[PDB]
Design a protein around this ligand. Structure first.
Ligand SMILES: *[C@@H]1O[C@H](CO)[C@@H](O[C@@H]2O[C@H](CO)[C@@H](O[C@@H]3O[C@H](CO[C@H]4O[C@H](CO[C@H]5O[C@H](CO)[C@@H](O)[C@H](O)[C@@H]5O[C@H]5O[C@H](CO)[C@@H](O)[C@H](O)[C@@H]5O)[C@@H](O)[C@H](O[C@H]5O[C@H](CO)[C@@H](O)[C@H](O)[C@@H]5O)[C@@H]4O)[C@@H](O)[C@H](O[C@H]4O[C@H](CO)[C@@H](O)[C@H](O)[C@@H]4O[C@H]4O[C@H](CO)[C@@H](O)[C@H](O)[C@@H]4O)[C@@H]3O)[C@H](O)[C@H]2NC(C)=O)[C@H](O)[C@H]1NC(C)=O
Ligand SMILES: *[C@@H]1O[C@H](CO)[C@@H](O[C@@H]2O[C@H](CO)[C@@H](O[C@H]3O[C@H](CO[C@H]4O[C@H](CO[C@H]5O[C@H](CO)[C@@H](O)[C@H](O)[C@@H]5O[C@H]5O[C@H](CO)[C@@H](O)[C@H](O)[C@@H]5O)[C@@H](O)[C@H](O[C@H]5O[C@H](CO)[C@@H](O)[C@H](O)[C@@H]5O)[C@@H]4O)[C@@H](O)[C@H](O[C@H]4O[C@H](CO)[C@@H](O)[C@H](O)[C@@H]4O)[C@@H]3O)[C@H](O)[C@H]2NC(C)=O)[C@H](O)[C@H]1NC(C)=O
Ligand SMILES: *[C@@H]1O[C@H](CO)[C@@H](O[C@@H]2O[C@H](CO)[C@@H](O[C@@H]3O[C@H](CO[C@H]4O[C@H](CO)[C@@H](O)[C@H](O)[C@@H]4O)[C@@H](O)[C@H](O[C@H]4O[C@H](CO)[C@@H](O)[C@H](O)[C@@H]4O[C@H]4O[C@H](CO)[C@@H](O)[C@H](O)[C@@H]4O)[C@@H]3O)[C@H](O)[C@H]2NC(C)=O)[C@H](O)[C@H]1NC(C)=O
Ligand SMILES: *[C@@H]1O[C@H](CO)[C@@H](O[C@@H]2O[C@H](CO)[C@@H](O[C@@H]3O[C@H](CO[C@H]4O[C@H](CO)[C@@H](O)[C@H](O[C@H]5O[C@H](CO)[C@@H](O)[C@H](O)[C@@H]5O)[C@@H]4O)[C@@H](O)[C@H](O)[C@@H]3O)[C@H](O)[C@H]2NC(C)=O)[C@H](O)[C@H]1NC(C)=O
Ligand SMILES: *[C@@H]1O[C@H](CO)[C@@H](O[C@@H]2O[C@H](CO)[C@@H](O[C@@H]3O[C@H](CO[C@H]4O[C@H](CO)[C@@H](O)[C@H](O)[C@@H]4O)[C@@H](O)[C@H](O)[C@@H]3O)[C@H](O)[C@H]2NC(C)=O)[C@H](O)[C@H]1NC(C)=O
Ligand SMILES: *[C@@H]1O[C@H](CO)[C@@H](O[C@@H]2O[C@H](CO)[C@@H](O[C@@H]3O[C@H](CO[C@H]4O[C@H](CO)[C@@H](O)[C@H](O)[C@@H]4O)[C@@H](O)[C@H](O)[C@@H]3O)[C@H](O)[C@H]2NC(C)=O)[C@H](O)[C@H]1NC(C)=O
Ligand SMILES: *[C@@H]1O[C@H](CO)[C@@H](O[C@@H]2O[C@H](CO)[C@@H](O[C@H]3O[C@H](CO[C@H]4O[C@H](CO)[C@@H](O)[C@H](O)[C@@H]4O)[C@@H](O)[C@H](O)[C@@H]3O)[C@H](O)[C@H]2NC(C)=O)[C@H](O)[C@H]1NC(C)=O
Ligand SMILES: *[C@@H]1O[C@H](CO)[C@@H](O[C@@H]2O[C@H](CO)[C@@H](O[C@@H]3O[C@H](CO)[C@@H](O)[C@H](O)[C@@H]3O)[C@H](O)[C@H]2NC(C)=O)[C@H](O)[C@H]1NC(C)=O
Ligand SMILES: *[C@@H]1O[C@H](CO)[C@@H](O[C@@H]2O[C@H](CO)[C@@H](O)[C@H](O)[C@H]2NC(C)=O)[C@H](O)[C@H]1NC(C)=O
Ligand SMILES: *[C@@H]1O[C@H](CO)[C@@H](O[C@@H]2O[C@H](CO)[C@@H](O)[C@H](O)[C@H]2NC(C)=O)[C@H](O)[C@H]1NC(C)=O
Ligand SMILES: *[C@@H]1O[C@H](CO)[C@@H](O[C@@H]2O[C@H](CO)[C@@H](O)[C@H](O)[C@H]2NC(C)=O)[C@H](O)[C@H]1NC(C)=O
Ligand SMILES: *[C@@H]1O[C@H](CO)[C@@H](O)[C@H](O)[C@H]1NC(C)=O
Ligand SMILES: *[C@@H]1O[C@H](CO)[C@@H](O)[C@H](O)[C@H]1NC(C)=O
Lengths: 622, 620
């Protein structure tokens, strides 16, 4: 009766875009030009970032479908031509080539093909040839189901030349998982200046059935995030571990026989666990996110193995801890029958393997010999505070974006995580500090996609204050703050860091100084004077139904509702549920069966000890 | 008016015995003599097995408290005098010595002491001395919080002599975990005939912080069940594994320098996992149970590590799978920096290590050298069907007992597991077979102890049809079949293997041929003619509350309540839950607000697609 929250967000603060079941995947956001590029099957879209509903299917698209030759070879004798032999876009990157243009790569019917196109989704002139395009190693997956990553890097490579860094698995029939860098071309004079870079082929010490979840350029390096079969666990069982790997941007490879291989490739296990004498590990990373303005923090989701009892967690990682693992001890298995042990630093050659050098071919061979035999660091990368930001049983958390909020006049700084689930929901998790410790609270759960439709991509725009979600059927823009629309109660309003309750107008608003807010729940009872007792009348003998929410908000549905009654000649007491007098509803409601005289009076409803709503009941003689 | 199940069982089918916070622990059940012996702090009781409330505190007890010097020395070491420095009974075993006597061992103020007493809880005459009795060191723990085990064996030991086998800690401050056999005495002539047997002292390959949960004499062996730090896991992290260890009762030890050590000690990991490409392990065994008349099956509880996300499982084991591990390949860590690998059979000496022999000192030294370096088998003992009988998230399962109901027709059988939790509850799980596949069903949950009072011991008397639970505050006898008391509905009655529904009396009775029963849920409409049916009226469109149970039984809250509405103008349709019209009640009810003309009709309540109760709604 009192509180009603409109469902969200699959019913304005929500904008949809769809041209059919085109398997939308791969985001590239250009805030300065109000553009959200979205890849799809045989297509790339340029959506209006401010309001993706204002984009038109026929206008804001560029068709990139395979040739009849590539479709023929892909079908062969037997293969699905319906989606598997289409051109699934997997890479969309900003690329400098006589101005700001887009580098695009697609699966192209199991024949990865890359392109360079204008920002307005037009081809370059037919006479315009871009050096390196269509040549070399496949730059994106052969398979639409492959989990790959890529990042186009303008600065820091050998000779100041641009290059694409990428991790991919190519065909699943063959076993060629690789982290590679494209050939270094001078795009002006067309000369190939340096050969490509790649992990040693078929070396399971470098990659063992990886699934890539992200890649970033930071400082003088490029970092890759993936999960893989844990080689160092084989003597104890089968496990999938999470990895961050690192290469120097200026890596040129070693001497003649190994010049095509990385000379600086290292990787480390990522630690996401609940701390104790027996740490509980979430071993399988699902996605990683970096704030565009912060190159020092990485936020990632991890799950247990999805067989058996399931749990998910969110952990955060500081670049100094990542690099600490790469500056620390190496791991080593001396023989195939040996334990995995740390290497004495006195055994490490000089210069230290993994450090950057302008001329890696000049490094002593002992350095290259060592790094090719010790790609794995001994240290597992420390997660901040040694515990998950957030963890949850029986949920698979996948994509995530992270926002930042500062209230400098009250000295409160919050992170807000938006984390997708395999069921199509978004978790709204706020992080805050209290007495030197980090805490989190699940602020909200809303629906972004039906259960049968997985969330394939998620990104975030600080400029538009919107979250973008891609599924197989549409793209969905969701405002990260819906204070006025979503929260009609002080109770819900003050828990959201974007919001604040205005007791004057009795409504939830975007936060500003002077509004009620308690993200950390450190002033419980702040909403007491904002609970407006609703007076109601009822005749003698008829059934009355008291309820705060029409439907209890999802994040609150598993908390305790306790009702109290205060009438004349009766002290205030808790309402015990009897079969034919007091009934509870799964929404925290109170039903009065056979109302008599003494049933009238004050009724208070508390949720985990905090006052939720109040009623004034009057009963006549009928 | 509604189905009502009264609470159970903390309040004629439940009997209590208590003489104070005496820390009741250690059961020994003598069904032939209607006795349940219970150890306690400084006390041992003999309870009437048929009805433990008949027992009298002052009459059915023998005080066994430490000497004043024992208590003095116990607090000299820095222990707490109130509880730690008392004599906690930890072993009660039947023992032949001029008749049927009892072997008793207690912690005795961190100075383990053992005794031999009569079955009626009286001391033997002081003139009568029992050879070997006196010091309990190696026989029961120093610490009341220790998890130890022991079994007294009359037959199969060297020279036909009796012996106590035990796993415990041999030192109160220093760590000396040991699996141990007492000195072989001839109790008639009083001579010490053979020395004790023990695992090599301080050898982490044999025991590494073990917590023992049971021990049994089976065939020519004694088996020990325990969990311990997983030594073969150290290169990958920290873990606790579950083990079964085995010694030959034959065992006399090797030659002169190692004569005191087992020559036949082997152990193997125990596998309790959900089967898949990535098995999910429950690694920490909590208790093990064997049926008195069956030496081929063992039933155990396993938990994940209690830090982090928690689950518990019940797995069963066949003796042949246990011995298959001991007959299989050995595990080996060649050097301290080596992987753990299986040993080529051609490298194993003869006679095969771990096999029994009348004269183990005669075994070639190479056999003894091998078995002392390779105590751990490569194979992990297969659990039956490769999956838990039953597993549950968010609960810690501890003690368990298992009953067998024999069906005459077609040689079938039900197993009923009674499994305690740390919260004081007993899970009642029936296991049944169908097309050669194993199934289980959680039939009931009831309360045997308050949450803050953990369950310390649990046993089962098939003769009396009762289980017995020991807590710090009391002993509780609970009938395993409470058909008439617990179930007042056909729905609940037919699912319990002990019970059957009688339509003539409209009640639940102990099962006999003719009553309705559907443990396997193969005739879902069996209770349709016996469901709760009633008619209700709603005036002026007031809010109406339909319901079947007073309180939904705990095991039924997991299923989905669905209401169907039959009208002459709307047909039979499932009532869609809409916030402005239809609300759910935590006890399976249906709340119709703003009743109208079209709301009238028949309302059937189904629990997971089985009819629970039906309504006839008319509106005026
Ligand atoms: C992710 O982040 C988590 C949170 O930050 C982090 O949690 C911390 O986890 C640990 C568990 O990993 C918690 O517990 C501690 O565990 C320590 C390690 O103990 C075990 O490991 C020993 C070493 O074995 C490795 O190293 C050998 C030599 O290289 C190899 O031969 C082995 O094969 C093994 O190698 C593996 O691990 C190496 C290091 O990771 C790695 O290089 C290698 O490649 C391979 O992967 C074992 O010797 C030890 O076994 C001994 O002890 C057990 C009893 O537990 C016996 O059963 C065994 O038979 C054996 O004798 C373990 O298997 C412990 O040392 C540590 O103990 C100290 O602290 C506790 C209190 O915290 C004291 O009670 C205890 O007495 C110890 O105190 C003393 O010593 C230490 C140093 O020795 C000293 O600092 C201290 O002041 C005191 O003097 C403790 O139990 C820990 O609590 C967690 N922290 C928090 C804050 O929660 C997690 O590890 C991270 N994960 C990863 C992967 O990094
Ligand atoms: C409890 O009961 C459960 C239910 O009954 C059991 O479940 C079964 O679990 C297994 C997994 O454990 C599932 O199988 C899939 O795994 C197996 C095993 O493969 C892994 O192990 C291989 C061998 O590693 C070990 O032996 C080496 C040789 O001795 C050692 O050098 C090494 O250090 C390992 O040692 C440990 O294990 C052994 C044996 O247990 C032990 O003696 C040691 O002391 C030590 O503890 C590895 O080679 C594999 O690695 C592979 O993957 C790497 C990438 O990560 C590659 O780099 C590498 O080259 C290799 O490819 C794995 O780590 C597979 O054999 C099995 O194969 C499928 O496919 C083959 C194809 O031919 C087929 O023949 C198989 O039948 C199977 O279909 C699977 O991949 C089972 O599915 C599962 N069973 C059921 C019914 O669900 C559980 O095992 C049991 N637990 C215990 C502890 O007993
Ligand atoms: C990818 O590949 C492209 C294409 O090759 C490359 O771009 C080229 O870089 C070179 C090197 O910087 C450029 O060459 C220089 O260009 C400047 C500017 O020239 C134009 O503008 C002037 C007006 O100021 C006109 O007069 C001229 O005709 C051009 O239109 C010149 O000033 C440079 O001249 C010096 O060096 C020449 C030899 O290299 C001499 O012949 C000449 O006399 C000049 O010498 C004087 O200056 C030197 C220092 O600059 C000094 O060392 C001498 O002693 C002497 O004092 C030179 O021609 C070229 O224009 C670029 N081309 C394009 C299309 O941009 C990219 O650099 C490459 N990418 C990467 C990452 O390497
Ligand atoms: C790239 O990375 C992604 C993400 O990490 C990988 O995606 C996993 O991919 C596999 C294979 O495609 C998926 O597994 C499938 O899931 C299907 C949907 O199953 C759910 O829904 C069913 C109802 O329709 C339900 O029955 C099913 O239950 C089963 O799984 C439960 C645990 O997941 C288990 O408890 C149940 O008992 C039961 O076994 C699921 O709830 C299913 O129909 C398929 O048979 C198959 O299982 C995973 O869902 C993907 N995971 C995620 C997080 O998206 C992808 O494989 C990677 N690519 C490569 C090449 O490796
Ligand atoms: C802000 O913080 C306040 C505390 O700092 C919150 O108030 C408290 O909230 C808790 C619940 O989180 C209430 O909890 C109690 O829980 C115990 C134990 O609970 C368990 O056992 C029962 C019985 O089996 C089981 O049913 C439950 O599910 C639990 O597993 C109960 O015994 C108590 O009766 C009570 O329910 C506190 O009562 C409550 N008040 C105080 C003063 O602690 C407050 O809700 C927070 N506000 C927010 C988050 O908006
Ligand atoms: C022998 O085996 C036993 C069973 O496996 C082992 O038992 C474990 O013993 C430890 C320590 O004695 C217990 O840990 C403690 O739990 C208590 C009480 O916990 C409960 O109450 C608190 C509130 O007071 C609540 O927060 C918890 O959630 C519990 O509800 C704590 O107060 C202690 O600080 C400590 O954490 C284990 O709980 C217990 N586990 C089980 C399954 O019984 C025993 O340790 C073994 N003996 C030896 C010598 O190792
Ligand atoms: C623990 O110690 C107990 C006390 O000694 C053992 O019990 C004793 O067992 C012996 C059996 O050897 C038993 O003796 C029997 O034989 C005696 C002599 O008999 C022989 O002599 C006749 C004629 O002299 C000859 O023809 C036969 O071939 C044979 O060689 C008899 O005098 C005696 O009455 C009896 O028949 C002892 O009586 C018995 N002692 C007691 C107190 O029971 C016990 O065996 C041992 N436990 C184990 C497991 O070894
Ligand atoms: C005895 O066995 C029958 C046959 O399985 C049980 O009926 C079935 O119960 C399951 C749930 O255990 C029902 O499944 C569910 O369907 C809903 C709606 O589609 C879905 O949301 C759930 O995820 C689940 O899949 C199933 O519909 C139902 N079958 C029929 C015909 O009603 C019955 O509950 C068992 N009875 C007892 C007392 O165990
Ligand atoms: C985002 O764009 C869509 C489409 O242009 C807007 O939807 C329209 O809303 C106006 C006024 O509310 C109507 O007159 C149109 O008929 C709507 N068009 C469609 C296709 O529904 C939407 O309002 C825009 N949202 C924002 C926040 O500007
Ligand atoms: C088990 O023994 C208890 C204790 O003797 C019985 O409880 C008593 O029942 C008798 C009647 O048989 C009453 O006279 C006593 O007042 C009861 N005492 C208590 C403390 O309850 C109990 O009835 C016996 N149960 C069975 C099944 O024999
Ligand atoms: C407890 O049991 C012992 C052992 O049977 C009893 O002691 C016997 O008492 C009878 C007399 O009734 C004597 O003839 C035996 O010689 C005794 N045997 C021993 C080994 O002492 C004792 O009387 C019993 N006590 C009670 C109270 O029943
Ligand atoms: C390495 O290259 C950078 C950039 O070209 C340059 O500034 C630096 O001086 C070089 N250092 C050496 C030692 O060659
Ligand atoms: C071992 O002793 C038992 C009984 O003591 C006997 O039956 C068996 O034959 C003996 N075996 C050998 C090899 O002496």
């Amino acid at each position: 009766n009192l509180y009603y929250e409109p469902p969200c967000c699959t019913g304005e603060h929500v904008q949809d875009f769809s041209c059919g079941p085109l398997h939308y995947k791969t985001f590239y956001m250009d805030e300065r030009n109000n553009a959200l590029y979205v890849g799809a099957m045989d297509r790339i879209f340029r959506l209006n970032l401010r309001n993706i509903s204002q984009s038109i299917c026929e206008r804001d698209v560029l068709i990139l479908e395979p040739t009849g030759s590539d479709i023929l070879n892909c079908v062969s004798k037997g293969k699905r031509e319906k989606v598997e032999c289409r051109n699934h876009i997997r890479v969309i990157q900003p690329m400098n080539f006589n101005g700001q243009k887009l580098y695009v790569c697609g699966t192209n019917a199991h024949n990865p093909k890359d392109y360079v196109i204008n920002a307005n989704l037009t081809h370059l002139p037919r006479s315009q040839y871009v050096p390196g395009i269509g040549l070399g190693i496949g730059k994106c997956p052969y398979d639409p189901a492959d989990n790959s990553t890529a990042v186009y890097v303008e600065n820091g490579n050998p000779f100041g030349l641009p290059a694409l860094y990428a991790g991919t698995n190519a065909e699943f029939t063959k076993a060629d998982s690789v982290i590679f860098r494209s050939d270094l071309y001078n795009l002006t004079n067309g000369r190939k200046e340096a050969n490509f870079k790649r992990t040693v082929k078929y070396d399971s010490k470098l990659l063992d059935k990886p699934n890539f979840v992200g890649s970033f350029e930071i400082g003088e390096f490029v970092y890759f995030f993936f999960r893989e079969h844990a080689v160092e666990y084989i003597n104890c069982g089968k496990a999938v571990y999470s990895r961050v790997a690192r290469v120097c941007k200026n890596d040129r490879g070693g001497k003649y026989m190994i010049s095509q291989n990385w000379a600086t490739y290292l990787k480390a296990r990522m630690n996401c666990s609940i701390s104790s004498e027996f740490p509980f590990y979430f071993n399988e990373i699902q996605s990683v996110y970096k704030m565009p303005t912060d190159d020092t923090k990485f936020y990632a989701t991890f799950t247990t193995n999805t067989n058996g009892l399931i749990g998910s967690a969110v952990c955060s990682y500081d670049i100094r801890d990542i690099n600490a693992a790469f500056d620390g001890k190496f791991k080593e298995q001396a023989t195939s029958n040996s334990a995995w042990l740390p290497v004495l630093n006195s055994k490490v050659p000089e210069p230290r393997p993994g450090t950057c050098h302008n001329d890696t071919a000049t490094l002593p061979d002992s350095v290259l010999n060592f790094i090719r035999k010790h790609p794995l660091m001994d240290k597992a990368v420390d997660h901040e505070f040694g515990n998950p930001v957030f963890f949850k049983r029986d949920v698979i958390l996948t994509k995530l974006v992270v926002d930042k909020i500062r209230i400098d006049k009250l000295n409160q700084e919050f992170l807000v995580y938006f984390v997708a689930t395999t069921s199509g929901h978004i978790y709204k998790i706020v992080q805050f500090m209290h007495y030197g410790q980090r805490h989190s609270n699940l602020v909200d759960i809303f629906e972004a996609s039906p259960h049968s439709e997985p969330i394939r991509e998620m990104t975030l725009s600080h400029k538009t204050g919107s979250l973008y979600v891609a599924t197989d059927h549409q793209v969905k823009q969701i405002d990260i703050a819906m204070c006025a629309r979503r929260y009609d109660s002080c109770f819900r309003c003050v828990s959201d860091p974007y919001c604040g309750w205005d007791k004057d107008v009795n409504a939830c608003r975007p936060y500003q100084l002077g509004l009620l807010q308690d993200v950390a729940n450190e002033t419980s009872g702040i909403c007491d004077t904002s609970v407006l007792r609703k007076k109601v009348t009822s005749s003698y003998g008829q059934t009355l139904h008291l309820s705060c929410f029409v439907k209890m908000p999802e994040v609150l549905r598993k908390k305790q509702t306790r009702w109290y009654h205060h009438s004349t000649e009766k002290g205030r007491y808790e309402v015990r549920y009897t079969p034919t007098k007091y009934i509870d509803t799964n929404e925290g409601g109170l039903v009065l069966l056979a109302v008599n005289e003494g049933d009238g009076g004050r009724y208070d409803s508390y949720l985990d000890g905090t006052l939720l709503c109040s009623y004034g009941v009057t009963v006549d003689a009928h």
